[model samples]
Target chain A: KADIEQLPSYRFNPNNHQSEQTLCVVCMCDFESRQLLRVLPCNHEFHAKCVDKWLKANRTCPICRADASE
Target chain B: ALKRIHKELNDLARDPPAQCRAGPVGDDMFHWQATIMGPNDSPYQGGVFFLTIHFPTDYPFKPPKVAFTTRIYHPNINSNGSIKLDILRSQWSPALTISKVLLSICSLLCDPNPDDPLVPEIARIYKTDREKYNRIAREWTQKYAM
Candidate 1:
């Protein structure tokens, strides 16, 4: 509840923040151009639609096991 | 959701871990069955354990619902067949594959995650009376899985 709503979100851009992988592991799909993303504090990014849903149930960064908010 | 599971099926077909096998139960892409051959070094060796898998409509985004169909006498597995595992619980991530999940279960048979356990008495026995636990577990394996 308190953990997920406050997450900082941004669009995927080569300029906004660089990503390590081509696709979001949450959906197992490649990132589409300019798609919305939720960038965690750990610097891992995933599809806003996908990661947010996972955040609803869990609060850690899926990739690095860091607090998504902290 | 179905397309993603289809991709997993293709991936599973291409490469799978040793000692485990899985597939859809029938026409229902979301429902499936899996099998894990007992680890050679464990009490369950030679036993073929079966599991039921149900991918949610929003799969890949969620962990597949998997439970043992064959009874296992282990600390992490309950009589009801539910498993006490982080990946199946709060640790679930979308990146996990069925093969990985089954492999974890297979390895678990060889080594019980005794600290976080489903069956308290079983876990206690495994810790306090380690050798006794093996025989009982072996007895159950022979009774049910042979």
Candidate 2:
């Protein structure tokens, strides 16, 4: 036990979803359904259907609201 | 529109989204292809989705219309190829990029918001029997997504 390797691990808890999980920032809630779509950079993911509607309404990222519009 | 697409593409190439993993299929900047994995703990957990984007001559000002070349069962994506998402429709802006648009679509697969919805019936089920929802989505992926 003198020398143990420390590996990086991720802990995912939807019940405790926050910035790391991003609350589906676009929809403002947890992914209510299965089969979610994940956004980049922010790593904020959401239900494919939900974000589809969100993107349709706003081009910017849901959390950062960065200028995604083209 | 051609100029707009190039500018947007350049911007995305500079700073791409986190989960966004794809590149142009051919040298044609107007045609791009992307592959996104379904988020974890969702019905699409083990699935990988493929999408193709065809930018019109005048993009940015006009959103790039998208279609799930891969069949998916969702309210926003209709039986036909038409997508009910707002961005591709009436909510288009002049600054949206193909990468941004693709990333947004990835987000949609994992989170479906009911407050303002594209398919009301699907939204209702999504709120109520979520297990069934995942099962259906999983089945859809097995049957449709390549």
Candidate 3:
């Protein structure tokens, strides 16, 4: 398991459905209905589990390569 | 594996880049063929290069192996068409897609990394005798790449 257990969790709310059209590029899968996602400061989001594993190995957002360390 | 490959194929088909095209080679979804039109205003202009991509079982987790099938005269590419780009190596990220890779290759053709060249001799000529290098590159591009 990745050490991203401390990352902020984002609850899906209809008011915040702006990025719903985007899919998790890691698994090439769409976010499940109302699935929780990990929101990066870059405004890109991914499946919590997906981005967590990625962040553990790489300290950058998968979408923009934004430095996660910041 | 199929999901990612299929998604890439669909994406490429729907919105292919102007400089390149890619799709499966045969019935094998794991193997693909890509064609990249040499960037304009470069020595390789008017040339068409081919590339091959092979995906691993643990793809998206591991970077795909990409090699040029057609001959190209460039500092970063070898006679055998092997490439020397950081993104293909340790700099790879799972988020990078086949379309993005092709675009990056196209960009590399426009602006090669002579500092870290696969063919140091080519890099030398490119730096010292740019005209001569461009002449030979144009010749080779006309002969094999077109």
Candidate 4:
């Protein structure tokens, strides 16, 4: 609770255990292995870090152009 | 690209709206936490409400889902941590900013239409026991919002 309560729309909850490799599909940054966040019907990984903001924007999956609303 | 988004936030903050009461919570400009005080004379008087706004990559073009973090006795706000507000859900537009959305939420607190309610029991209570409903809602505010 910094100044306000931020509800993370990103699916990856840091509390959960992650996989070994951490990678960013958009920025093309490959760091290390971490948790495995589901890519969804669109098949995009949020790195247990970046997915929340992506989901909050549009209902569509980032990579494959799948309808998230479905 | 990032610069443009940053500019949008800066412009919003430079001349912020007076009616909406919320700002960025932490170091991140995209993630914001907000609390709105219930409107005067509404069933939600004296209620301090909490919410979470998550901005996606396409923010202006898409509306963030604002969920109620507090247990409210309102028709639109459900006990299961869901909000039935039109802006956050069925009726949303990219032109809507964070401040505008928060103000709309405050307005909803003041005038909850039982016609479209997520919590029908609460709506029923509101209609049947107007006074009792107020008391219970107030009590809920005290217990949860504290």
Candidate 5:
């Protein structure tokens, strides 16, 4: 199991939008540019703060349940 | 809290699972009642289990509290019907939906995790005397859950 601090965070940019995906799935809100995000190994991303708290209790990717550590 | 819950409610209604049905209790979006039909080929077959789910205000971030209102016999589920599941507790994530939780419970009925069981006695019997465990479980399902 990995800790929140061990995860990496990055700033959001619309230019990097891969598809029509919008919401973070955690807060059920759209992603805002300049907002910080924590990207999981599965390539799924969520608000940094949202996933930070989540990783404290859960060590797997929220969408795929893949090992976050990997 | 309400938005996520509403989305999930709609999602569940649109694409219901085979073994489970869940929805809010009356107009209260936070409190939900769910029914999970026991999986076929398991000792719990022919039984119907009811469960209650209480979503915290910080839902999706925090996992919901779920408990069985119907009695069941299984190593992972206690006599009181309380289930000991990691996903329901610490392993929960925001991406997990209510349908998934019910599906997991249904699968648990089909394959009880004896290594990490809520009832050690039941687990011991399940490991040592498989036939006796299935018989008792079937009896309990017929008597209490059916």
Candidate 6:
């Protein structure tokens, strides 16, 4: 196996009102409202296609630059 | 990936910053040409520096590789035009856009880095003989970038 339990992944939705985080820092695009996402250990979130691939290469949060991996 | 690149291109077209201008050379979205009017109050004030940008297929997942096509005398940027900077290397973040990057390059031109120099002797001159470095940097600016 590559690692531990499958890392947390989520689907994006802003059902009632707009949440502040509508843009993916990786792509710098507004969340399409239906895409994969991952919350870092630092509580920051990004698209699974974005942050998952990024955390594998980068050691910190893209926005905050915190050491945000296991 | 095209969508993101398109957005950046559109954004830049509508809202450009610095004395810099950047655009694709042709139909290929992968490569682009950029120009930076050297920062004011610096030896390269009148210089017009051209650079190249190559984007990977993954778009923002991989930082676009940028380097100068127009040569200049500087420690950070070598003769081959590689920028030996931490941000473009170890510290690159996904959030960094090309727009901001051009601005950073302008900043780098204003403040040369002697810490991790690509041109060791140039940086040594930059550190020890400030006036000599300025004269030569200005010389190259006029000779090549004018």
Model 3, A47-66: lDDT tens per residue? 88777777877787877788
Mark the regions of model 4 whose C-alpha exceeds 4 Å error after superposition: A1-70, B1-8
Query: Candidate 6 regions off by >4 Å?
Result: A1-10, A34-36
The TM-score of predicted model 4 comes to 0.59
In order, the TM-score of chain B in each prediction is: 0.95, 0.78, 0.96, 0.81, 0.95, 0.96
Residue lDDT tens for model 3, B30-127: 99999999888888899999999998886776688999998998999998889999888878887888999989988988688788889999999999
Off by over 4 Å in 2: A1-70, B113-121
lDDT, candidate 5, B1-146, per-residue tens: 78989988887888999889999998999999999988788888898989999999989878888889988878888866688988888777787788888898788776878998899999999999999999998998898788
Please provide, for model 2 over B1-146, each residue's C-alpha lDDT reduced to its tens digit, 9 standing for 90 to 100: 56555565666678877666555678897888777776677777667777777877645435676776677766566555456677677666443556767777877777656666677777777788788777788898777763
What lDDT score belongs to each candidate, Candidate 1 first? 0.84, 0.60, 0.84, 0.62, 0.84, 0.82
- B46: Cα error in model 2, Å: 2.4
Q: Rank all candidate structures by their TM-score, best first, as comma-separated numbers.
A: 3, 6, 1, 5, 4, 2
Q: What is the TM-score of each candidate against the true structure?
A: 0.82, 0.58, 0.91, 0.59, 0.81, 0.88
lDDT of 2 at B100: 68
* Candidate 3's TM-score: 0.91
Candidate 1 segments whose C-alpha is farther than 4 A from its true place: A1-19, A32-37, B113-116
DockQ of each: 0.49, 0.02, 0.70, 0.03, 0.59, 0.69
- Choose the strongest candidate by TM-score: 3
Q: What is model 2's DockQ versus the real complex?
A: 0.02
**Model 5 over residues A9-62: C-alpha lDDT tens digits?**
778787776545566878766788889988888878888887777777667778
Clashes of 3: 0
List the lowest-lDDT window of 10 residues for candidate 4 chain B: B1-10
